[PDB]
């Protein structure tokens, strides 16, 4: 399973952001809003292939969570779909990026702003977000934002849709990497 693939929790479906590891422990990052209140994650709708359990979740304020893998045999590719990812980097205004998610597949665009605040309401406010002109729809939360073989962010949310165009905000991946002491491979 790789970046952009569907993940299912108890309550719904999100997308895997990046496979990461620490030492010999494998994990995957996804959105914090998807990890919040989820314990176990599966690879399919039927909930028959287990992936693992949530190890951390940070949302609102930030929007990142991490799941430790407990399934021993499923392949954990360090890619996004077939794309290899070899490092993480900070987003910059005008950077060309690409997102992949379990609902809309792959879409590209550019970083239009940094450090934005997105208010999802109800006191769910997230800060520090990367703004872009890439579209995203329900189910794509937590999938990767990357540029080339560089990991850049995790889909958090925004507005619009892929038919008419939209605005999507991503959580900077460097920040989750550092919070958890893990790294892309």
């Amino acid at each position: 399973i790789s970046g952009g693939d569907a993940i299912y929790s108890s309550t719904g479906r999100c997308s895997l952001g990046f496979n990461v590891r620490s030492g010999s422990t494998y994990y995957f990052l996804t959105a914090g809003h998807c990890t919040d209140g989820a314990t176990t994650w599966w690879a399919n709708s039927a909930r028959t292939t287990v992936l693992g359990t949530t190890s951390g979740s940070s949302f609102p304020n930030n929007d990142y969570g991490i799941v430790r893998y407990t399934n021993t045999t499923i392949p954990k590719d360090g890619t996004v779909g077939g794309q290899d990812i070899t490092s993480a980097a900070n987003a910059t205004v005008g950077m060309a990026v690409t997102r992949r998610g379990s609902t809309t597949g792959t879409h590209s665009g550019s970083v239009t702003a940094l450090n934005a605040t997105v208010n999802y309401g109800g006191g769910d406010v997230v800060y520090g977000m990367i703004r872009t002109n890439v579209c995203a729809e329900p189910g794509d939360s937590g999938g990767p934002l990357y540029s080339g073989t560089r990991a850049i962010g995790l889909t958090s949310g925004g507005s619009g849709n892929c038919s008419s165009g939209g605005t999507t905000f991503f959580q900077p991946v460097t920040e989750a990497l550092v919070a958890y002491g893990v790294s892309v491979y």
Binding site: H33, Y120, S141, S159
Partner: protein
């Protein structure tokens, strides 16, 4: 589902579908409620789950 605190400028993107009266599957509550607003209150919830 109550869309009174809507609209909202952004929605998270987890998928927990709802079926609207326009027969469209809305991917989650924030998306369904912003469309309700957008229709100026004419779209209603037909049922939970996909259409």
């Amino acid at each position: 589902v109550d869309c009174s605190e809507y609209p909202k400028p952004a929605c998270t993107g987890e998928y927990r579908p709802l079926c609207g009266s326009d027969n469209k599957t809305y991917g989650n509550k924030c998306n369904f409620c912003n469309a309700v607003v957008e229709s100026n209150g004419t779209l209603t919830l037909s049922h939970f789950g996909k259409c």
